[PDB]
Design a protein around this ligand. Structure first.
Ligand SMILES: *[C@@H]1O[C@H](CO)[C@@H](O[C@@H]2O[C@H](CO)[C@@H](O[C@@H]3O[C@H](CO[C@H]4O[C@H](CO)[C@@H](O)[C@H](O)[C@@H]4O)[C@@H](O)[C@H](O[C@H]4O[C@H](CO)[C@@H](O)[C@H](O)[C@@H]4O)[C@@H]3O)[C@H](O)[C@H]2NC(C)=O)[C@H](O)[C@H]1NC(C)=O
Ligand SMILES: *[C@@H]1O[C@H](CO)[C@@H](O[C@@H]2O[C@H](CO)[C@@H](O[C@@H]3O[C@H](CO[C@H]4O[C@H](CO)[C@@H](O)[C@H](O)[C@@H]4O)[C@@H](O)[C@H](O[C@H]4O[C@H](CO)[C@@H](O)[C@H](O)[C@@H]4O)[C@@H]3O)[C@H](O)[C@H]2NC(C)=O)[C@H](O)[C@H]1NC(C)=O
Ligand SMILES: *[C@@H]1O[C@H](CO)[C@@H](O[C@@H]2O[C@H](CO)[C@@H](O[C@@H]3O[C@H](CO[C@H]4O[C@H](CO)[C@@H](O)[C@H](O)[C@@H]4O)[C@@H](O)[C@H](O[C@H]4O[C@H](CO)[C@@H](O)[C@H](O)[C@@H]4O)[C@@H]3O)[C@H](O)[C@H]2NC(C)=O)[C@H](O)[C@H]1NC(C)=O
Ligand SMILES: *[C@@H]1O[C@H](CO)[C@@H](O[C@@H]2O[C@H](CO)[C@@H](O[C@@H]3O[C@H](CO)[C@@H](O)[C@H](O)[C@@H]3O)[C@H](O)[C@H]2NC(C)=O)[C@H](O)[C@H]1NC(C)=O
Ligand SMILES: *[C@@H]1O[C@H](CO)[C@@H](O[C@@H]2O[C@H](CO)[C@@H](O[C@@H]3O[C@H](CO)[C@@H](O)[C@H](O)[C@@H]3O)[C@H](O)[C@H]2NC(C)=O)[C@H](O)[C@H]1NC(C)=O
Ligand SMILES: *[C@@H]1O[C@H](CO)[C@@H](O[C@@H]2O[C@H](CO)[C@@H](O)[C@H](O)[C@H]2NC(C)=O)[C@H](O)[C@H]1NC(C)=O
Ligand SMILES: *[C@@H]1O[C@H](CO)[C@@H](O[C@@H]2O[C@H](CO)[C@@H](O)[C@H](O)[C@H]2NC(C)=O)[C@H](O)[C@H]1NC(C)=O
Ligand SMILES: *[C@@H]1O[C@H](CO)[C@@H](O)[C@H](O)[C@H]1NC(C)=O
Ligand SMILES: *[C@@H]1O[C@H](CO)[C@@H](O)[C@H](O)[C@H]1NC(C)=O
Ligand SMILES: *[C@H]1O[C@H](CO)[C@H](O)[C@H](O)[C@H]1NC(C)=O
Ligand SMILES: *[C@H]1O[C@H](CO)[C@H](O)[C@H](O)[C@H]1NC(C)=O
Ligand SMILES: *[C@H]1O[C@H](CO)[C@H](O)[C@H](O)[C@H]1NC(C)=O
Ligand SMILES: *[C@H]1O[C@H](CO)[C@H](O)[C@H](O)[C@H]1NC(C)=O
Ligand SMILES: *[C@H]1O[C@H](CO)[C@H](O)[C@H](O)[C@H]1NC(C)=O
Ligand SMILES: [Ca+2]
Ligand SMILES: [Ca+2]
Ligand SMILES: [Ca+2]
Ligand SMILES: [Ca+2]
Ligand SMILES: [Ca+2]
Ligand SMILES: [Ca+2]
Ligand SMILES: [Ca+2]
Ligand SMILES: [Ca+2]
Ligand SMILES: [Ca+2]
Ligand SMILES: [Ca+2]
Ligand SMILES: [Ca+2]
Ligand SMILES: [Ca+2]
Ligand SMILES: [Ca+2]
Ligand SMILES: [Ca+2]
Ligand SMILES: [Ca+2]
Ligand SMILES: [Ca+2]
Ligand SMILES: [Ca+2]
Ligand SMILES: [Ca+2]
Ligand SMILES: [Ca+2]
Ligand SMILES: [Ca+2]
Lengths: 5, 1077, 361
């Protein structure tokens, strides 16, 4: 998603 | 011995006024020694020198409202009383055997369980809750071709299809259905019920969840009558001239009934504590500043200005009755205004923040901007150590944790094994430990600062309802004074956890209004918690127990990931704008963008000796005598021994006893320091301190480092061991002794044949362990799902968030109990989730307008042209979607219509990148690495004329290869130069082991590669025909040609000859010789 | 009469300006950019042309050389090409050959450099590799010891320097669009010419950079220039036609050929164009390279290599032996070429012709 390092 | 920078000795009072150290015994001595009298503070010790009510007849039932009904009609299925008195369970409508035709109609919920006297049992019609009357003692039937055909239920009319009603008795007429949108007359309940507008806010729960009667519509505020008009009794905004004017117009003379003499000149009426305000028609009590109007509307309570509002004073607050005093923590000077605190140590702070590919040194004001390290893989989180001036970090592209002094020397890897995806870390500077989190194993670990003695101290779930479990842990801070570990989590049930530093007393801190808590930190002077949310976009601080939250920034933050606090300014890292910003740590004023970044900055830290306060080590100089981990007990008042991850903790009367218990595939060190995997044994790399890892009787090693070696000399990946598949030639990976005590990690589940599989695939209706042990009914029945996962009657395990998912998960619809899912118990998370319009699904809010049908009815993707994108950190697509600004010009179509990539100006390369020929940036270590990385090998261009990296070996062709790959016995350079110039390995002048063939350019391959038709070793010694003149090949498939070569397989019948005379394409073999006629 | 050379994307075609007919030449090639020739260095009768190639994707560009007949006509001869061994080229938009010595000049456009080496490309070394964006075609004036090169990027410039890389200077930088081709009038006081794909004009200026003049205008997107006798040659890139006009710009635009848009350059094949009579100033004292300069010469080393300490002649780099050239088919006057077991080009004479390689008859 928009929150994966 | 010297006092630490800016502070005083362990026994010395420091004056808040000017920082000079005053003797300890001078504190509270009755004399103001300090320049502002801070040594005689408030907390210093003092000195001492019918016939009746409701009863018409005893044979007539008594309704709760006073009505009288016949008692023989009780529990007949209808509310005869009108207030459910005759059908009330507390009126004995329960626990009794309903008799004869009046079946019990087994069900939990009272209203539909009423024992109606049904005379129509087995008629072929559903008559109560589950319609079990057609199954008590009944007969089967065959469906008519016209009506709906319930499989379990009765064959009923088609009007029952998709109507919010259960008709087959098990909702089978509503399974797979949808709902047309409710009309204007029908208000749509949150769970999907269409209710007419006659029932909205009718003080009755008609939807079944209470949505219709929620306070959003059931407030209806009364008139206020603001200034220039006066309110008397209920909203009468009559003129102030109508006040006590002898005209009764203010309802029932609300103002003429009072309006007497001043009632606060005496205690007979007012009894106000602090002040009086006698005014028109009445009076009201009020309190002096520093006191809060108590709930009884009579008296005053002292405000706790510190705990209630830490914003008032900067660092530390001491409450006093009706006021407050703020003192600065040890090491700070209180400014003459009495509120601001200034750091006293002459060491100046500077931000260390973890960019991708770099560790950076940014000064607080923004004047300087330097590099600490460069050329790293991907640094997702780092943390410093003040005691030794070290610097620890994670490298997600290499799955390692390194360390290095601050003067850039002595770089060293400390952890390389069994680290799947480490999300963050922190350094326990007190008891010398290293804490980190991993997202795949979903656990909290702990290790010695040097890497030895790893342990697991938190797993499964955090709470007594497994409502909060490790799903995606991220961010971790320590409070060694109180012995606590804090860590965030951005799973479905996003929260902030807390635990002691030995595993006990785990708890949940924050569990409301939290969706994406990427970051967390503590201000060690305030003892105030801090965190940021990337979705709701806030920066909230709170007390260490989670109470009294306050907002620094409210929704204006695009996407924070890691924050940090020094003095009074908070620095965070924002991914969407790719910037590091700063501002005041309470209100957020004075916002300043410190620097731009070409890559998203992951972590950040203020490096300063004050950021790790000095305090006494509990395990000091002895480790408490524990031979293993000496952890700090919760509360920071004592220590506690422990054992590593594969030892058994046994307690004696006075000494803990940890002994090894590692598996058959694990090797235990001679001095019993730890256990290492068997494939680590016998490789030359001294993994073990005492040296038992590499004996002199060790057999020769053929495999590269990390690869298990079969007994006959072959190689395989470590996961191939004891996997029930013979992966070696002789199957030494399948030897019984290697598997007898096999074990694997917590996230995989073991089968009967000792191959262990992921726990999600267990009882998944698919045979994985080859033995059908994962799909055995006996185990698939008795097993319990791990904490936090709901269990189906089918045996499958699902995450608890998938109950009431609407979509089937268990296959038997065990995960969709409609009756439970349709009540208030499964509402959407308010102001964090989006509710669908037809179904009862609740989806995360950020899935609205994302190019995918989340609500299963396109509700989430409707009206996408109206949603506003973020004012600062968003890019607006042509199809009205919002994407993070970091994804514009990144080179990938993200919006779905190539809006981001249109008119894309190529970006600039960073300090460690090389600009390709077609204007693209790649890592510098990809230049001349024997691979096409710039799309057209333009990186490989012209490198006979440049040196490589310090740790890389250069081939004669200019390519760079890792040094460790040189002289290993295998061709790695393109021209095999890495082996052509280095000496023999054995005293007898032989190059490689006799169990392999030797090529003349000093690279050795396996025996079977000889005359394989391919130039396996670059010199071509294997392809020399004289070798296989004496070597046979596999006659049934390996075509021994006329000149004794053994061309085979796919290169038979090809387009060109490999034997040299075309016999491998001859129309004698490819053409069917007999083909079994 | 001069012979015209026209390289296309796939084939190279030579056209006689007087016979008005085409003839067969090298075929079966892909993605070539520009050509240049040297007039019979061995004095046998076959001149050597140097055609460079570019490549797409994984494969790199290269430079190759081939023979060309100097007599009236030649056909059916199996012309064989050889790769110079110059690796790491993206696209060689510029390429020139120096007959005074055995050096070759070519600028790799994507590598933003100017590369020189031996005729077989052994002692490679970059001349200048700074302050360039899109290095265009290269011109050389051995008599004055000055080269010419241009850039057609965000800073269109025309520059000249010595053949050893020093004394770099810019001729003009104003009223310039996209230069594409360069040419030098060896007889008119070494006057230089250049084109423009944006301004659509051809301008001339002296070697030092004085008296800039607009010779002709509205040339319909010229690409490359060539000056012979008293006329100027240019080719319309967007149409592929070849035109002639007086080099003084006082004559109508005549039409000669109409070719496909794959045409890249127009080059005149004549000895008088280069005036091979110029002697070599080198004393054969240099170890690896002997570059030219006005009034003398200089020694050079391969790229990234330095002289031996204390000396300015001997290079630390190793010296590699030269590369031989395969023999061509010298069959003359309508002869045919054949290869025996020795693979020697044994010609097959036609009727009425005898002798080795079939001369006269
Ligand atoms: C980059 O920066 C790092 C960190 O500052 C420097 O590393 C330090 O270098 C110094 C000087 O070599 C080291 O000091 C020496 O440490 C030895 C080991 O002491 C251990 O125990 C003490 C006490 O608990 C710890 O403080 C210490 O960390 C060790 O664990 C001592 O035995 C040495 O003693 C000798 O010198 C002292 C005076 O300093 C004399 O009194 C003694 O008689 C004896 O001669 C010495 O003190 C220090 O230990 C290093 N740091 C660490 C953490 O190891 C790098 O030097 C620096 N590199 C560069 C190139 O700048
Ligand atoms: C990695 O895995 C591969 C298989 O993929 C192994 O290949 C085997 O290699 C061994 C030798 O290391 C081969 O053994 C040879 O067998 C010959 C007879 O074949 C029969 O017996 C073997 C088992 O030993 C069966 O596999 C086979 O089906 C037949 O039933 C023997 O004649 C050979 O004797 C050699 O040594 C003696 C004593 O010095 C000499 O007198 C002989 O002249 C000869 O040199 C030998 O024992 C085996 O056939 C191979 N199997 C397969 C299927 O390939 C690799 O060995 C292993 N990696 C390494 C490096 O060992
Ligand atoms: C130069 O020197 C190297 C050694 O440095 C020589 O290589 C050795 O060659 C000998 C002869 O083939 C090898 O000895 C034989 O090894 C067999 C396999 O065992 C090895 O591999 C297993 C794998 O599990 C290890 O456990 C084990 O320790 C060995 O490393 C054995 O099965 C053989 O035993 C059989 O023969 C002997 C007699 O030779 C009998 O006594 C036994 O009962 C049995 O029948 C034998 O031991 C040796 O392993 C090789 N070493 C290596 C490392 O290569 C080169 O041949 C030599 N080169 C030249 C040309 O000078
Ligand atoms: C609301 O209630 C408070 C508290 O009762 C009132 O505060 C009072 O303020 C007066 C005026 O400052 C104080 O009187 C002063 O006392 C000192 C010391 O005795 C004396 O030196 C001065 O000359 C003066 O008399 C009084 O002490 C103080 N009350 C208390 C208990 O502290 C306030 O006036 C009230 N305000 C309203 C609007 O009702
Ligand atoms: C991050 O950046 C800051 C600022 O650029 C660095 O601070 C610098 O640190 C060095 C080493 O301590 C200082 O040099 C030393 O100064 C002291 C005092 O004058 C002197 O006694 C020593 O002999 C030495 O000269 C330097 O002055 C200092 N600069 C500033 C402006 O503070 C810091 O070291 C950087 N950190 C890393 C890890 O790179
Ligand atoms: C943990 O789970 C229990 C149920 O086992 C919760 O107790 C229920 O709480 C809900 C409201 O949250 C009530 O409607 C139920 O009546 C309660 N049932 C029982 C039997 O207690 C408990 O509240 C949960 N823990 C917390 C702190 O919420
Ligand atoms: C274990 O965790 C609980 C919270 O889950 C801690 O209880 C709090 O402790 C603080 C400080 O002692 C009190 O101020 C709070 O009132 C407590 N709250 C609750 C709800 O219990 C408890 O202190 C922790 N125990 C240990 C070992 O530290
Ligand atoms: C970041 O980039 C923007 C746009 O180029 C620029 O205005 C801003 O000044 C940069 N940041 C800083 C702090 O200089
Ligand atoms: C629910 O969300 C609304 C905003 O939609 C907010 O006003 C309210 O405070 C929230 N809390 C509840 C449960 O009402
Ligand atoms: C004095 O002690 C402090 C605290 O341990 C620091 O170590 C400081 O560096 C010391 N000062 C000197 C000059 O050694
Ligand atoms: C102080 O002294 C008095 C006598 O003067 C009493 O002993 C009193 O108990 C003392 N207070 C404390 C706290 O010890
Ligand atoms: C399910 O619960 C039992 C106890 O009732 C055990 O804790 C068991 O380990 C659980 N299941 C799994 C897979 O761990
Ligand atoms: C050689 O090249 C590498 C990669 O660019 C480094 O720049 C290195 O410092 C160079 N080595 C020398 C000695 O200049
Ligand atoms: C190669 O190395 C081995 C190491 O034991 C021996 O020194 C051997 O003599 C070496 N071979 C040569 C030719 O020096
Ligand atoms: Ca005092
Ligand atoms: Ca009843
Ligand atoms: Ca019935
Ligand atoms: Ca229905
Ligand atoms: Ca209602
Ligand atoms: Ca009135
Ligand atoms: Ca107070
Ligand atoms: Ca997970
Ligand atoms: Ca959520
Ligand atoms: Ca956001
Ligand atoms: Ca080892
Ligand atoms: Ca296996
Ligand atoms: Ca399974
Ligand atoms: Ca579901
Ligand atoms: Ca969506
Ligand atoms: Ca994009
Ligand atoms: Ca590469
Ligand atoms: Ca190697
Ligand atoms: Ca081979
Ligand atoms: Ca073949």
């Amino acid at each position: 998603x928009x929150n994966x390092x | 011995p010297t006092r630490p920078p800016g502070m005083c000795h362990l026994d010395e009072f420091q004056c808040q006024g000017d920082g000079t150290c005053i003797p300890n015994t001078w504190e509270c001595d009755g004399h103001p020694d300090c320049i502002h009298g801070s040594d005689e503070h408030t907390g210093c010790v003092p000195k001492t020198c019918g016939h009746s009510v409701n009863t018409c007849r005893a044979s007539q039932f008594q309704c709760d409202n006073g009505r009288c009904i016949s008692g023989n009609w009780v529990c007949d299925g209808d509310n005869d009383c009108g207030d459910m008195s005759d059908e009330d369970q507390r009126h004995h409508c329960e626990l009794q055997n309903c008799s004869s035709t009046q079946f019990t109609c087994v069900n939990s919920r009272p209203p539909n369980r009423r024992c109606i006297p049904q005379y129509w049992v087995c008629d072929g019609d559903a008559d109560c809750s589950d319609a079990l009357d057609e199954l008590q003692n009944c007969t089967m039937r065959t469906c008519s071709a016209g009506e709906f055909s319930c499989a379990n239920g009765r064959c009923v009319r088609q009007s029952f299809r998709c109507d919010r009603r259960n008709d087959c008795g098990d909702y089978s007429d509503e399974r797979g259905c949808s709902y047309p949108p409710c009309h204007a007359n029908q208000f749509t309940c949150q769970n999907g019920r269409c209710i007419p507008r006659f029932f909205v806010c009718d003080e009755d729960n008609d939807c079944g969840d209470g949505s219709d009667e929620q306070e959003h519509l059931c407030h209806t505020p009364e008139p206020t009558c603001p200034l220039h008009q006066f309110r008397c009794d209920n909203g009468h905004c009559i003129e102030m001239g109508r006040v006590c004017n002898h005209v009764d117009d203010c309802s029932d003379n609300s103002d003429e009934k009072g309006c007497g003499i001043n009632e606060c000149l005496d205690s007979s009426i007012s009894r106000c504590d602090h002040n009086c305000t006698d005014t028109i028609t009445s009076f009201y009590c009020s309190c002096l500043p520093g006191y809060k109007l108590m709930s009884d509307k009579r008296s005053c309570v002292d405000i706790d200005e510190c705990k209630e509002s830490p914003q008032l004073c900067s660092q530390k607050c001491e409450n006093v009755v009706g006021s407050y005093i703020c003192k600065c923590a040890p090491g700070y000077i209180r400014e003459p205004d009495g509120k601001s605190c200034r750091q006293n140590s002459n060491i100046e702070p500077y931000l260390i923040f973890s960019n991708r590919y770099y560790i950076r040194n940014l000064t607080t004001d923004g004047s300087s901007y330097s590099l600490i390290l460069q050329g790293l893989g991907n640094v997702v989180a780092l943390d410093f150590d003040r005691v030794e001036k070290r610097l620890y970090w994670i490298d997600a592209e290499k799955q390692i944790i390194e360390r290095m002094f601050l003067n850039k020397t002595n770089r060293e890897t400390i952890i390389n094994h069994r680290l799947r995806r480490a999300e963050s870390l922190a350094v326990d500077w007190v008891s010398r430990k290293l804490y980190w989190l991993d997202a795949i194993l979903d656990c909290l670990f702990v290790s010695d600062l040097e890497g030895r003695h790893r342990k697991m101290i938190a797993q499964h779930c955090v709470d007594a309802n497994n409502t909060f479990c490790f799903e995606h842990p991220r961010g971790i801070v320590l409070h060694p004074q109180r012995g606590h570990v804090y860590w965030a989590d951005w799973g479905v049930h996003a929260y902030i956890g807390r635990i002691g530093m030995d595993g006990t007393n785990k708890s949940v801190i924050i569990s409301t209004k939290i969706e994406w808590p990427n970051a967390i930190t503590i201000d060690y002077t305030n003892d105030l918690l801090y965190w940021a949310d990337a979705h709701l976009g806030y920066i909230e601080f709170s007390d260490l127990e989670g109470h009294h939250r306050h907002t620094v920034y409210d929704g204006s933050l695009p996407h924070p990931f890691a924050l940090t606090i020094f003095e009074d300014t908070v620095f965070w890292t924002d991914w969407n704008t790719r910037t590091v910003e700063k501002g005041n740590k309470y209100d957020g004023s004075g916002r300043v963008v410190l620097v731009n970044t070409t890559h998203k900055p992951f972590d950040i830290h203020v490096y300063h000796p004050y950021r790790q306060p000095i305090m006494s080590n509990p395990c000091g100089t002895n480790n408490g005598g524990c031979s293993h981990l000496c952890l700090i007990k919760a509360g920071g008042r004592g220590f506690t021994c422990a054992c590593p991850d594969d030892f058994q903790t046994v307690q004696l009367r006075d000494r803990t006893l940890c002994m090894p218990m590692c598996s058959s595939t694990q090797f235990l060190c001679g001095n019993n320091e730890k256990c290492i995997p068997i494939w680590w044994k016998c490789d030359g790399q001294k993994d073990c301190s005492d040296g038992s890892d590499e004996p002199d009787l060790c057999p020769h090693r053929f495999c590269r480092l990390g690869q298990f070696q079969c007994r006959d000399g072959n190689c395989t990946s470590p996961q191939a061991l004891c996997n029930a598949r013979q992966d070696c030639a002789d199957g030494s990976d399948e030897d019984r002794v290697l598997c007898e005590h096999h074990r694997c990690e917590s996230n995989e589940w073991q089968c009967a044949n000792k191959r262990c599989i992921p726990q999600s695939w267990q009882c998944d209706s698919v045979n994985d362990c080859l033995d059908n042990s994962d799909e055995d009914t006996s185990h698939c029945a008795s097993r319990t799902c791990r904490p936090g996962q709901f269990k189906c009657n089918n045996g499958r395990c699902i995450p608890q968030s998938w109950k009431c998912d609407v979509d089937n998960d268990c296959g038997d619809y065990s995960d969709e109990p409609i009756d439970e899912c349709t009540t208030a118990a499964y509402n959407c998370d308010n102001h964090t989730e989006f509710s669908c319009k037809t179904n009862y699904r609740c989806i995360p809010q950020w899935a609205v307008c994302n190019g995918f049908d989340d609500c299963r009815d396109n509700s989430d993707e409707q009206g996408c042209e109206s949603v506003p994108c973020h004012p600062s950190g968003d890019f607006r697509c042509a199809n009205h979607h919002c994407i993070p600004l970091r994804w514009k010009c990144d080179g990938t179509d993200d919006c779905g219509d190539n809006s981001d990539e249109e008119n894309c100006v190529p970006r600039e390369c960073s300090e460690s990148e090389f600009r390709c020929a077609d204007q693209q940036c790649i890592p510098s270590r990809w230049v001349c690495d024997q691979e096409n990385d710039c799309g057209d090998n333009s990186d490989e261009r012209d490198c006979e004329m440049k040196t490589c990296h310090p740790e890389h070996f250069q081939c004669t062709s200019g390519h760079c290869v890792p040094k460790a790959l040189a002289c290993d016995g295998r061709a790695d350079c393109l021209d095999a130069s890495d082996e052509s110039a280095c000496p023999t390995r054995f005293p007898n002048g032989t190059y490689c082991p006799a169990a392999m063939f030797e090529c003349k350019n000093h690279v050795c391959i396996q025996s079977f590669w000889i005359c394989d038709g391919e130039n396996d070793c670059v010199d071509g010694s294997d392809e020399e025909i004289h070798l296989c003149f004496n070597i046979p090949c596999e006659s049934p498939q390996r075509f021994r040609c006329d000149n004794s070569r053994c061309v085979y397989g796919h290169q038979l019948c090809n387009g060109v000859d490999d034997c040299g005379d075309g016999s491998d394409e001859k129309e004698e073999h490819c053409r069917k010789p007999t083909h079994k006629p």
